[PDB]
Design a protein around this ligand. Sequence first.
Ligand SMILES: [Mg+2]
Ligand SMILES: [Mg+2]
Lengths: 151, 175, 50, 202, 191
Amino acid sequence: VYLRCTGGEVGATSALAPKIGPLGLSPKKVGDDIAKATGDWKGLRITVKLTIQNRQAQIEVVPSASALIIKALKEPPRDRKKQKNIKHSGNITFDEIVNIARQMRHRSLARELSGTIKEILGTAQSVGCNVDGRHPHDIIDDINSGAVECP
Amino acid sequence: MKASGTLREYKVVGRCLPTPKCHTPPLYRMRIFAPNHVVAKSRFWYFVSQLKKMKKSSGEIVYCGQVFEKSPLRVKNFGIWLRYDSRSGTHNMYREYRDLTTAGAVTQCYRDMGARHRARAHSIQIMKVEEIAASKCRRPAVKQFHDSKIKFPLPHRVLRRQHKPRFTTKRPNTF
Amino acid sequence: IEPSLRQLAQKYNCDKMICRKCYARLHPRAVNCRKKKCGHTNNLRPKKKV
Amino acid sequence: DRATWKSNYFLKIIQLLDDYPKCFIVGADNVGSKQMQQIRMSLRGKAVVLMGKNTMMRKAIRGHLENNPALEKLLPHIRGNVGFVFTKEDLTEIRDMLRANKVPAAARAGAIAPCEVTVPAQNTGLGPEKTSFFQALGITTKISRGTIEILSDVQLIKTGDKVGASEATLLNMLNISPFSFGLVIQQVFDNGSIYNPEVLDI
Amino acid sequence: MKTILSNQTVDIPENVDITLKGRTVIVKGPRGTLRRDFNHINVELSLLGKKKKRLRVDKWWGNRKELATVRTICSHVQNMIKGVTLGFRYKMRSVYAHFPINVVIQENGSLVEIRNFLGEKYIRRVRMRPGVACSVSQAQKDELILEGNDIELVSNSAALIQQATTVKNKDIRKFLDGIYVSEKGTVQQAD
RNA sequence: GACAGCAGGACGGUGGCCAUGGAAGUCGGAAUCCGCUAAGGAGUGUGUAACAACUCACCUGCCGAAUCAACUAGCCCUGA
Ligand SMILES: [Mg+2]
Ligand SMILES: [Mg+2]
């Protein structure tokens, strides 16, 4: 099982990861092509890819990461063609999608059952951090929900 | 001042002249350490001219008296407050002295300031003198003289500079 | 090449504090130049490593 | 800080003493942070572990409040990294015997106890080259089909032997399990009883 | 600040005996005897205990440097007691470059002869102290054992060895060669 | 139960975010929170091109009661 946390375009410009792989020599172009097929429409930014190798090919699992899907919950798409307007727009509410996101986040947080994970993923950002009409200092103090409905 | 020899404590009271603008002057009182009463009166005029609107011509000294020690036969601890003027700028200072009398303790204060900090009698202004008891001394020297059943010998005690003959067969030992 | 013996030789020859004023090899945890040719200054720097 | 924080720690220890009358004494001198987090997140549904400095010597003051029986017998027992484990459930004698889980055991310089580490004739399975550590130590290796194999059967670390840096890095790359150690129970204390676990409990 | 007495406490075991005729300390035990002079310091050395052997190093008023000096007497008395009970053993591994170093002894372990010395042809001779012996260790490559009773004599012999093996007129960060002190310990171990 | 000393821990979110020759705490700009807590600073330094190892802030094991920091001025020293 190989793990890699990179993504811009697909690549294939005579530059790739494989280093552990060429002991068995299974990826040279087919792994990159199936990585392109698993990276079709998801997405246009850095993702996490782990490939399970069992004697013929690679199974490409995409485990979603927290800050990466917070960046994916921005306004899409921004890849090229007149970028940089400017760096940190991020005008979202995220009142339920981050909730479903840490519902999917299992066995990788060392967490209490939705205790202060709202504070974690509300203060672990640098672009958004709140609905545009309130304050994250009020997020830290004024959340009194989720801890009953989520467990 | 000169601080020649041991010092002496003088209680000096002084007031303004009785004027028709304001009679009954407040008749202030100070505690001046000085070798004699004339230097005590002059240093009194110096301090009261520093403090309030007073001078020697428009005022008078009512009484200038020797202050004897309340208990000369008791080894006491005195904290001295200092307003000494150094070479760069003046500084405040708290010192401690274990001695018998107040005038002797302030005498040791003048001698010790002139020894260590090169301070003349021009620069030293005694702010306050107060007897303090045990378990309040800030200094480790006086704190280590605070010992009951204190013991020390006198190692290498040489003396009698030419009281013996200058030319003898002796080879003098110590202790 | 004996890297443990190299560590021992670097302990006895390399990891020192050199003063910027008196130019004296002193100690790895030194504070002042022990030589009186500069005035016991604290202007030190670690000996240069590759 | 360190005054209101210590008063809050006093509030936490009086809350745990007033809530949980049953405790277990443990020692965790050789433990890691990831290991402690694994033990906590495996024991979230049961007893809670608490540690600390001489502020843990607090049952003396709890007896100076004069609200106790003669529970101060544990005052000469808190010596040499002694920590409390507060509980309410058990009433059950299978704790930590079915829960002494195997933990990494990552190779780090400093461990000597208790056994030897032997590396049999087995391929490495690592990329190019991974031979410089074997050249720094000295191991008869032969390059077969791509995974490089070892001809002989040598012993790296004996009993009571200090772990070196290159040895630790090659054990971390070969993933052969080094010395492992978990928290060890030392004294059982259940409601004013003096247990002698050599060998009475469980 | 003219501090009143500072006293250092020394316990002396029953294996050894101490004797003072003044400021001269004579400690005699199982591994020979050893005597030294403390004449230039002027600190009182008293002892007590009928077969209890409690030494005290006492200094009156003095100064701050002399209160620093009064602990040095206690530490050298501890060093003499360790040297007469156990002895001193310094183990020096020959950290050698491309050219190895041939170390032999000539005058029964009192003359260390050094050869091949980073390719320098000059055979080097180091005469040791009266009271220290030298040996080449067994079951270990190029280890040099210096054994003796007095820590100053043994460590001065080791300093003479490590300064006789010295890279000259070069960058001494490179050419890490010389006989350096690896281990400091005692002759009789486990004590 | 401090300063020193010896020994151990020094994480998870997260290879955070602007950056693509690279930063995955260690060139760099803006920041800055939570859980475990015995404690972890989106990190004081060494080092890697980066990935890695070491160390520090902080915590704990033994020892045991005084310790540390910044200024100031008298002698002496360097500057000479
Ligand atoms: Mg040259
Ligand atoms: Mg001069």
